[PDB]
Amino acid sequence: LARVENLLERLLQKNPVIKMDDKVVAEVVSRNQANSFDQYNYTMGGAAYS
């Protein structure tokens, strides 16, 4: 059972840090904001950028 403990310790070594990308998050946020902007423009007729 000692090697089970050794493997569990080695598996506890792993850093609990999960790097998450920022460029894709920004692009998705921009797309959703654009959807909201288009909705608001449509509800205002055409008195906006387009």
């Binding site: 904001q33 205002m44 906006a48 950028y49």
Partner: protein
């Protein structure tokens, strides 16, 4: 406008002298909420005992189990609203410039004809 009472009422309309507040409530009751009904809000820890008029609703499907979000006294700031305001102001400025370009051009157009009339009168004077 030219008189003073109209300018007084316009100036009164031109400012806002109370804190701008917006209220948001997460409601999970059985009674449905419509777009016209006025409810009574009681919330002791936040010092609320008043009548609230619904101005914004974000409802879920009746089978969706989710909460409802209800707004009162206008909405939170948000950026997309600011962008829409800036865009409509830009459009208004653009159309104003387009109109004023033609106005200046016809100012030049109304110029030359009257110059011709002045020249005709000058020749008549001689």
């Amino acid at each position: 406008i030219t008189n003073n009472d109209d300018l007084l009422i316009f100036a009164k309309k031109q400012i806002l002298d109370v804190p701008e507040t917006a209220l948001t409530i997460a409601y999970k009751g059985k009674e449905p909420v419509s777009e016209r009904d006025v409810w009574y809000f009681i919330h002791e820890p936040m010092g609320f005992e008043t009548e609230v008029k619904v101005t914004k609703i974000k409802s879920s499907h009746p089978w969706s189990k989710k909460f409802q979000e209800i707004g009162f006294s206008n909405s939170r700031r948000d950026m997309v609203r600011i962008q829409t305001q800036i865009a409509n102001q830009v459009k208004k400025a653009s159309v104003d410039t387009n109109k004023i370009n033609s106005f200046s051009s016809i100012a030049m157009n109304a110029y030359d004809s009257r110059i011709l009339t002045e020249v005709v009168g000058v020749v008549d004077g001689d």
